[PDB]
């Protein structure tokens, strides 16, 4: 193994964040200090080679807005140690106490960050395949880093024919824009999956959420173009969201909610 490799006494599993089917996840300490997230595999679910794929990649990929792998422990029991993100998923954060205080300048900024990361993903010819708020992590200063069956966030061509591409990732970005803009809500409210597949296929598209400026929705519709070669790149997305309040809506006034 690599010199990514650490002694499994340097780790110090402290507070249990959450759980799930594929092992659990903890806050903690590596070596002396350093806050850390500590992901683990349950010997029971998937093999060593399975849950050590997201280290094959998480090693090669370093970017400001992808959550950074710090070090692994390969021989089971497994422990992936990464950087700590201290407000939990985007969904919780937004959907929780602070959520209600965020307005459009803040959510647009978060979104510009996510796209900065999905544009580094882009440049490297990688493909995420499950881009949604639940898989974004948040930290101090409203920072947001990418890292780690969702039909409602997944592009038609992937949902049906299994063609995942960075453009099919852009589709979810647009769905993720609905998440930021309604502060946590499932897309396509009061629809089960068969309607979402049914209706997007007949051409339906989520409207403009409450108070959401119409320049935002246009760019969601740009992400939701049927023909995937047309949806804009994360590099376009990123810049648009970076300049939103000067180039697109420089006469924006804060409302009830956004």
């Amino acid at each position: 193994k690599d010199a990514w490799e650490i002694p499994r006494e340097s780790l110090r599993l402290e507070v249990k964040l959450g759980q799930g089917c594929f092992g659990e996840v903890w806050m903690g300490t590596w070596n002396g200090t350093t806050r850390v997230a500590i992901k683990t595999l349950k010997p029971g679910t998937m093999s060593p080679e399975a849950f050590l794929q997201e280290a094959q990649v998480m090693k090669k990929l370093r970017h400001e807005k992808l959550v950074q792998l710090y070090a692994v422990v390969s021989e089971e029991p497994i422990y992936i140690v990464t950087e700590y993100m201290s407000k939990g998923s985007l969904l919780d954060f937004l959907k929780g106490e602070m959520g209600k205080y965020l307005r459009l300048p803040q959510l647009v900024d978060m979104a510009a960050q996510i796209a900065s990361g999905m544009a580094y993903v882009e440049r490297m010819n990688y493909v995420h395949r499950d881009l949604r708020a639940a898989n974004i992590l948040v930290g101090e200063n409203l920072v947001c880093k990418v890292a780690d069956f969702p039909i409602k966030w997944t592009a038609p061509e992937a949902a049906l024919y299994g063609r995942f591409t960075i453009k099919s990732d852009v589709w979810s970005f647009g769905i993720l824009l609905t998440e930021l803009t309604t502060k946590g809500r499932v897309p396509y409210p009061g629809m089960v999956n068969r309607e979402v597949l049914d209706q997007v296929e007949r051409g339906y598209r989520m409207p403009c959420p409450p108070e959401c400026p119409e320049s935002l929705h246009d760019l969601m519709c740009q992400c939701w173009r049927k023909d995937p070669e047309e949806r804009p790149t994360f590099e376009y997305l990123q810049a648009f969201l970076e300049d939103y309040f000067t180039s697109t809506e420089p006469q924006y006034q804060p409302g009830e909610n956004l």
């Binding site: 010819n125 070669e229 047309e230 804009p232 790149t233 590099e235 376009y236 300049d243 000067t246």
Partner: protein
């Protein structure tokens, strides 16, 4: 140049803009573009655009196919269909990972030749921008939207030269300025001009000598063409022929790769 409405079937709306609408259509079996002009009560904007188009013939200018006048009042300009949409979108969609340097320079030369042709026929476009440049099925960029086209004499501020917004007369030199802006759009892959500045600062900053930064990964020589287009003293700006020659000098020595 007269066409018959009975042979035109309006299929779908390609774009609903502020000064007109464009629809994909079928005329005598072939896909075609149909445009109508808004806020034109006397139809003189319509007449002016159609007329000038009957006088333009260059391989890099969207070609007029004909005119349709229904006595009821529906006025349309039928144009060749450009399958790849505006240059702006084409750039944004495919982006950096697809469009090589040759492609970008090739687009610049396409537009530049169209412009050299217009200057050579004493016309001023006054509305040159990546949005107004369309791409055909086999990647040929062509200037379009000749509404504001008139012989050497509202204008989009972010694309218009300072003297043009201020002076009542427009000239090829303002067009050259717009070309400069457009190139920036090209090498920026559709990004919008003056990214981190309020639309109310542009002209004053610009006149105070501001100039956008060379885009990411932009060839220094290409950026110098842009800059050369942005001189504050219009007369010092290059001719479109001089622009073509320099873009060709760049291509010839592969200063863009």
């Amino acid at each position: 140049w007269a066409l018959n409405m009975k042979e035109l079937k309006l299929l779908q709306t390609i774009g609903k803009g502020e000064f007109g609408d464009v629809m994909l259509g079928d005329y005598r079996g072939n896909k075609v573009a149909v445009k109508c002009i808004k806020n034109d009560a006397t139809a003189q904007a319509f007449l002016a655009e159609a007329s000038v188009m009957t006088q333009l013939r260059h391989s890099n200018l969207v070609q007029l196919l004909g005119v349709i006048v229904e006595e009821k009042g529906g006025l349309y300009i039928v144009t060749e269909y450009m399958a790849k949409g505006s240059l702006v979108d084409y750039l944004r969609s495919r982006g950096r990972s697809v469009l090589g340097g040759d492609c970008l320079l090739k687009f610049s030369l396409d537009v530049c030749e169209a412009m050299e042709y217009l200057e050579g026929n004493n016309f001023v476009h006054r509305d040159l921008a990546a949005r107004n440049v369309l791409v055909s099925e086999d990647n040929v960029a062509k200037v379009s939207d000749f509404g504001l086209t008139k012989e050497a004499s509202k204008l989009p501020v972010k694309w218009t030269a300072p003297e043009a917004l201020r002076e009542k007369k427009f000239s090829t030199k303002s067009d050259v300025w717009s070309f400069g802006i457009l190139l920036w759009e090209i090498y920026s892959f559709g990004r919008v001009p003056y990214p981190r500045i309020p639309l109310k600062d542009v002209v004053p900053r610009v006149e105070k000598g501001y100039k956008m930064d060379a885009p990411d990964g932009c060839p220094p020589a290409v950026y110098e063409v842009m800059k050369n287009c942005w001189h504050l003293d219009a007369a010092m700006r290059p001719s479109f022929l001089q622009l073509r020659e320099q873009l060709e000098h760049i291509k010839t020595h592969e200063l863009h790769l």
